[PDB]
Amino acid sequence: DPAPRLAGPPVFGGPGNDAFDLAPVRSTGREMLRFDFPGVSIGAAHYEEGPTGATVIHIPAGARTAVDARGGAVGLSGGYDFNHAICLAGGAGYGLEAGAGVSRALLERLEHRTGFAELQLVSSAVIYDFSARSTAVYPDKALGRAALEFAVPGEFPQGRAGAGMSASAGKVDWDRTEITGQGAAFRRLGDVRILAVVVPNPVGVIVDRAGTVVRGNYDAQTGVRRHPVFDYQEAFAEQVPPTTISAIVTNVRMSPVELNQFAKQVHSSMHRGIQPFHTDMDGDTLFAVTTDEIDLPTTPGSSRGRLSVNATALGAIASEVMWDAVLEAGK
Amino acid sequence: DPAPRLAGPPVFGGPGNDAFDLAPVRSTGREMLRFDFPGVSIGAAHYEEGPTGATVIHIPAGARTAVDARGGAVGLSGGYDFNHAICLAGGAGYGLEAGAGVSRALLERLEHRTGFAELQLVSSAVIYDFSARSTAVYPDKALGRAALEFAVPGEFPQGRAGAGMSASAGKVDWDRTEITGQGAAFRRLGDVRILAVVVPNPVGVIVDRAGTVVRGNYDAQTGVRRHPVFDYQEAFAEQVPPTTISAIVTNVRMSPVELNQFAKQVHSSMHRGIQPFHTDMDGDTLFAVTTDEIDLPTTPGSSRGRLSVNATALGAIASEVMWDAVLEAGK
Amino acid sequence: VDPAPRLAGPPVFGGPGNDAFDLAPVRSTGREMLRFDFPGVSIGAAHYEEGPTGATVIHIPAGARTAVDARGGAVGLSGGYDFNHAICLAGGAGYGLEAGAGVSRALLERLEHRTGFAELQLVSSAVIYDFSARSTAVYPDKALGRAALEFAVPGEFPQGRAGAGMSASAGKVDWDRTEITGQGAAFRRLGDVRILAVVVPNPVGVIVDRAGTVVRGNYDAQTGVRRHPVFDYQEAFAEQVPPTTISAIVTNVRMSPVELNQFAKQVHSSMHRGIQPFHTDMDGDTLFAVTTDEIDLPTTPGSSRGRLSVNATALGAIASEVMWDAVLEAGK
Amino acid sequence: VDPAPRLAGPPVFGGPGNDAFDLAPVRSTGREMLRFDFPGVSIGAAHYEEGPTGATVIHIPAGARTAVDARGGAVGLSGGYDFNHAICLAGGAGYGLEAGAGVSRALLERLEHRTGFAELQLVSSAVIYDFSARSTAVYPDKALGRAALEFAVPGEFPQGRAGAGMSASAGKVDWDRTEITGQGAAFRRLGDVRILAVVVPNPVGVIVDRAGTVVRGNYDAQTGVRRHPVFDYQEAFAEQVPPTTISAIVTNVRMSPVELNQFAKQVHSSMHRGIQPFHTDMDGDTLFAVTTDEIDLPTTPGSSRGRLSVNATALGAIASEVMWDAVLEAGK
């Protein structure tokens, strides 16, 4: 069982962006994931003064996207069905401003052309990360611009980096909440590529494939993490009466209908590794993005089964890549 | 590991409803679950000639409902935000007819009154159960009427009963698909009551809390069940290039917004016990029903945490009741 | 001249249900038959006189891509599939969804009870609440849906009090001012582009013509005229707060699922021109947009009449006019 | 007399962006000021002359329950929250969502950078694409949103070319027939019931008056008149296929989340009376319905004008008229 990373008690009343001369820092995290996915770049920037940050997935050619905004408390901008970038950030709704920095930078690179087919489309989503620190600094336009400027192919900074600087899990009680991070994972199968990026700031906890609670809801009195349902059920017996933001990027061609159902499938699959999930208190948002490079076969058979090669199959594989990313964030 | 229940190869071309004098049978299943939930009755009927059936949850007072029709291939009638009954049936879209039998019977009990506030509201959902047998018999109006007539308080027939007669799991290849059943579970916590009813006919498999595949995708060549993702990933490496219908019934008062988010949360939670889930091939539909009898406290604290008594907490508990029901169906 | 009143009259209580009668389906002929040319689409309308109530079925045996826009607050819908062999529109409130089950079973029997995936017969159904306009509880049952399918023929539609429109009515600020409507259809061919609109207006609101005149619903027998409901509503607020329409649009033009869904929303909203108010909490307004996928639009949208003149939006605008014509036929 | 033309003119390429200019926000005054009495609601409108483009902000410091009806096919939306302290409407296509970020930051600073849940300042923003109506790439940026908030006052709205309406335009079958619109507002008080409509029509379609006359958009300089787009569309099909509006409705009447959501849909659909076509694939039509939760409706819906005359549907019908008035002010 990993050592605790308790976030500690809230400290509200701290300084905001106006109080500082804020210098973006290129986030490196605890280690770098390297992968091969041409046409996809990732940048991450933070302000130490928060600490808080933004992570940007840049696909300069633009890519078809489906959004599954399933949570009860979503903070989303754009949510477009085609994107040049996805911006994930802390700072609650204020952090949507980071995406404006990305949009503006992309407009400038386009030489301020504004034809419909030239509009640069950025979708952004946010986590509330203010309870995990004692400043009011947030990802502003300048920080989103920096994250884009820092974007490079084939690298992702794991852990406390970008949007994951002050992400945290397990919010039955803030005395038991632990810092998470951001995470990524990548698989290549034949010509198929799947990249998962996640910033888990859940009300729930991170759970591994054995069912062990590995991050969140850590009680310093016991030295042990608990699945929230044990707290909830005892709370009811006593008293009645007395957000995760994520992206899956693939190169497989999917129709709008397939892509949208793929998004829903992968997003629901994350209730395996984050529990509870999709709650009223969460603003869970998944972006499913395809670069539309590889055709699935017209018929779905293989030696492994009559119905084995299709978008559902891809969704099941992508679900595993995403669980791996969640576990990297919690590590 | 449980003994296999392989469904076997499709047999299309069999007789339909017209070929028989169809006698409804009161379904008893393998065993009866007994529970205490005043105002809620359950009836289950089948035709042996299918075998196929319908299961009806009757709440004569009517109850607030949210529907989460999350699957790609849903077969739903009504989907109302207030219901006197929920009808779950086999027979694919033809089995929606069983719900008409329930509606008509309720109209007759109301003495054919038709004022707005007197309309009897039945929501129905279906599974495709024709690949698991060799007739075209389906749950018709007469069978829905019978299921309602057989409804009694505080009993549920587990296993091959009602809508679960010919339910099956694990559909990467039909040579590895196994018969499931229907299942229920019940918990009472203080004054709070939660009943889960499920009819798993998934493309995916049933998974227990340890991560063991316990029903579906059984290979007679090996004697072992496999998680579908192992088949899918190898299929991709080789070739590129070379429904669950459910209800959660509770007595806790929830606003329409809370109830709807509760539905989404519990439904996503079922991706723990059914994998994959919410796929394009599935018509997954969950009804969340409240009899609106018990208030949650106005503030959410307990000795177990500051945020421990609320609708999210209820959703986490209900999720466990539903997983128990799924495992009963697969037993 | 203003249209003569067709007041529905007061609600009547205690009336019998289906099995009180030996119910024979009647092939509905309405006031007039619309004739049109659209191979692959058949319309059947059946009623029970004892209601009076009925069902109208659109049968497209090839199956057709469909978008559903269930925009009202009080929708009664079954199936709502993205691909359909038939659409069933019926009276009887939620009980009338049973008529669609009759259509489904009849189609299953035509397929010799085959049940493979590619042969599942898909029927979407929607209903109106028509019990305030008569004094029985008879509803469109499985037998009536079956009969409407059996009566379906290409190129004909019975206007007026026929099928699902038999007891449709409009203008429900007060039941003393509610008038019987009917069902309606209209058809246009532009080259080989074909657009068929079918509507069963049972609105809370009233039917309005292109000049803005209220022509069916909210007839005040004390004044002899119809005025817009908003006059009643605004007067009611000053006093007391002191200081369903089911429809289908069928076309032969290929539209992607995304285009077709937006087309549905556009055409459905356009009906707030002819029905006012519309899309209210009290309404179960449901439109089915169906394409038989026969004709492509040009790859680029230009013509002599503009750079953006030939596209799904353009088709939506044309279809919206066909639908308004259909609404006015229902109210006529 | 038919209105004089306000043709937008052809698209112009190569124009500069924000930092090419020393951009000073200007408080927009429009052609005329609407004055009204609705304490708790403030409106600010700011523009950059160098665009010309602008933003219009509705500030409700108590916070207000909101329903969003993002019905168009090409929506540009940020937040879309069910509870808002401000609504920001802006030009600049998706880039103009940045104006809302300026509003959010300004509100955060008024709260002394407090960040507890109950103090998060929630701003929903929507945009129009206004770059075809001018020859720069200037957009509403964070500074302009901040300025529009700072300029917000109760009881005033600048009609016409002001705020987000500075470069709004209508009628886009062909750009040679597109006309500048503006923004518009209307207000009614019925007792102590208050209804404010704000609209920024940038439609593909045209603005239509209550008589059915096209009054802004699709002006053909070769004929000197405006006709409905459907005439162009139908002619285009015969030839080539041979054989955004952003808006808010604010009221003080308490509505549950369910009523408020249906109210939004009803009022939004009603705008297809004044804007035609509407809700098209080409439009990003987004309506915000906001209630300040001050007045209850009576528990039962009766009055002298009918049994079902005082309810959220009634309120929706009245609000729909206020909105049509606002649309006509924008087109005037």
Numbering used by the authors:
A (entry chain B), B (entry chain B): 19 to 260, 267 to 355
C (entry chain A), D (entry chain A): 18 to 260, 267 to 355
List passages from the publication reporting this PDB structure.
Nylon hydrolase (NylC) is one of the three enzymes responsible for the endo-type degradation of the by-products of nylon-6 manufacture (cyclic and linear oligomers of 6-aminohexanoate (Ahx) with a degree of polymerization greater than three) and various aliphatic nylons (e.g., nylon-6 and nylon-66). However, the post-translational autocleavage of the nascent polypeptide between Asn266 and Thr267 generates an active enzyme with an α subunit (27 kDa) and a β subunit (9 kDa).
To extensively analyze the effect of amino acid substitution at position 122, we constructed 10 new mutants in which Asp122 of NylCp2 was replaced with other amino acids by site-directed mutagenesis. The values of Tm (melting point of the heat denaturation) and ΔH (change in enthalpy for the global unfolding of proteins) were determined by regression analysis using nonlinear least-squares fitting of the CD melting curve. The Tm values increased in the order of Asp122 (wild-type NylCp2) < Leu < Gln < Asn < Arg < Lys < Val < Gly and ranged from 52.9 °C to 75.1 °C (type 1 mutation in Fig. 2). However, the D2 symmetry was partly altered by mutations at position 122. Plotting the protein stability (Tm value) estimated from the CD analyses against the distance between the two monomer molecules revealed that the protein stability exhibited an inverse correlation with the a2/a1 ratio (index of symmetry). In other words, the ratio changed from 0.979 to 1.197 from the wild-type (Asp122) to the mutant (Arg122, Lys122, Val122, and Gly122) enzyme, although this value should be equal to one for a perfectly symmetric structure. Notably, this distance decreased with an almost linear correlation with increasing thermostability in the wild-type and mutant enzymes.
